[PDB]
Structure 1
């Protein structure tokens, strides 16, 4: 007779349910898993065609290129409120929620096997024309909202009223236009065709996405619950829910639906997320002096004065000293070595 071993140890489930469950006070080594999802905002013309953009626009003239919101797919964003972790942070080492991992996938890929609804004909008596062409799938998870940077083709494009587009588009906007810095803070608001996550700055969020242009590139998608993604950074930390909030943003133009007519429209599917969070110990950034200042500015005035800042700062120079140094022979510390036209 052989003896059946003790079953291995596994993390103990404390409670399972909806977002409410978050509310249970857990230990410090607790950790949680959040399964949420996002619907796509492809345009949603009427209330029958969801996950469909409005019929798509064709050869508009630059000067008169004014599309309608309904034919402008936008980034889908959303925020998951998490429980404040530290009670009286009267003192120092507090806890923030850290996004560590994420599993994600596109809900309903199979759905594109209905070659029999509005479908245009493949040919003669063939099946219908499957969805295909240019597509973009992207997502991101982070401890603050998604920071963007606008770039577009044809800055002269007039943008639908309800959207949020780069302002003061110039020709430079057709390439890197540093002014077009924004933040994804409104669902179905920022047209994917005007924005891309600003690399210069998403320090507390991680994103990924790929574009595949093509008149008829075949969508390819994998569905599996065996794959995970890490959000840890080089120091081994993931996004930090600064404001005890978790932000999810995603976009999924699976491609183009070619109606019977020959008209085409963007299709999107929703995306899933499973986010693992842990209680991470940080160095309380927010406290006292900041509330101090927070306050004092309310007590004193804001003065609209001459520019001590930015491009037009009337501050010509600032020097900062710390210790002492042997008296320097050359007072204008040759700092850089001077290569312009030498």
Structure 2
């Protein structure tokens, strides 16, 4: 049975849609040629990081009043330290063909993102906004801007750089920001005003890595694609555009995107929109969330680490350790180690010494007077 091709009109071939729903849907088993899109969002984290707090949630997506202290040193509080936002999406397991030593992982192709809530900035009538002049309207949200987002299969690799090492950031006490002092274990040295390779940290928590001190390390982030922007000014205007047609491609120069290690999609973003000028003259930053529509596909890969080496490397650590006399390292208790293979004609010197050159070829040592 089949319909008449002439009697029946033809239509286009759009990609077939299997399912549309929430997070509980990713569990669906899909073929090797399937494609996944995830629409999600991240609220900003700028010191006031929770609306559930009964006392101080009036300033969610805001900071407390920013002021220079006036006397060294500086002691800023967490509520004045806006930090990056981050989240992880757990992806389902996939097949593997151990016979060919190849498995398959998720990769990201494209992300469709846009800053949400831009329309809310035209509110020039917040009851405490500083009038630009007498009998006038409010000073629109403007000034400093910082925008970045990062997509990768690993947590984003960061770099530490602070405008002044004299500042003393709050200590990490089971909560609170994490600063270079927390990573190194020492007070910040004036090297940190420049680039210090010692000051590096993976982005592991939300709202705990302030933007003032951390910046994306360009060296290590090879498995992540991050984009940035900034403008600094007293009351310079903020400009933003938005649409749902602009998409961004994440493939590299070699044709691969970020590979989700641990079947986890790592996302990080941060968007400052400007100041909130108050009648008191006091000032405070502000932010607003970000929209993400990451597209994912299935890519086959070859296991780089052969399983056998992992097995022994695993149980050895699990097996009870053995604290014997040192047999490796600086104080090894080993004197000679010889290695034989095959038969050769008898050489003259029985005290001969041979080794392998830096190029892997066989070499015979010519004896020399040891000083």
TM-score normalised by L of structure 2: 0.80
Of the three residues 132, 149, 159, the one matched with 2:169 is 159
Alignment of 1:70-85 (within 5 A): 70-85=79-94
Please give the per-residue CA displacement for 1:27-60, whole angstroms capped at 9, x wherever unaligned.
0000100011100011218211111011112244
CA distance in 2, matches of 1:142, 1:267: 26
Q: CA RMSD in A?
A: 2.8
* Residue of structure 1 equivalent to 2:252: 233
Partner of residue 122, structure 1: 132
1:87 deviates by 5.4
Match of 2:222 among 203, 208, 211: 203
Q: 1:205 Cα shift? A: 0.6
Q: How far apart in 2 are the matches of 1:23 and 1:47?
A: 36
Instruction: Summarize deviations over 1:128-162 as a string: whole Å, max 9, x none.
Output: 00111111010100001001010011112111231
Contact kept in structure 2, 1:57 and 1:67, CA below 8 Å? no
Max Rg structure: 2
State the distance in 1 between where 2:24 and 2:99 align.
27
For 1:55 and 1:97, how far apart are their aligned partners in 2? 44
Instruction: Label 1:197 to 1:83 Cα distance change in 2 as closer, same or farther (>3 A).
Output: same
**Residue 29 of structure 1: which of 33, 39, 44 is its match?**
33
1:8 alignment partner in structure 2: 12
Give the counterpart of 1:95 among 104, 125, 129. 104
**Aligned in 2, Cα 1:242/1:260: closer, same or farther, shift over 3 Å?**
same
Q: Which moved more, 1:283-292 or 1:147-156?
A: 283-292
> Secondary structure at 1:240's aligned position in 2?
coil
C-alpha separation in 2, matches of 1:130 and 1:301: 65
Out of 245, 259, 284, the position equivalent to 2:278 is 259
> What stretches of structure 1 of length at least 5 have no aligned partner?
310-318, 329-342
1:298 Cα deviation (Å)?
2.4
Q: Among 133, 136, 140, which residue is 2:150 paired with? A: 140
The residue number in structure 2 matching 1:47 is 57
Q: Aligned pair count? A: 320
| Unaligned 5+ runs, structure 2 | 1-5, 50-55, 331-355, 366-371
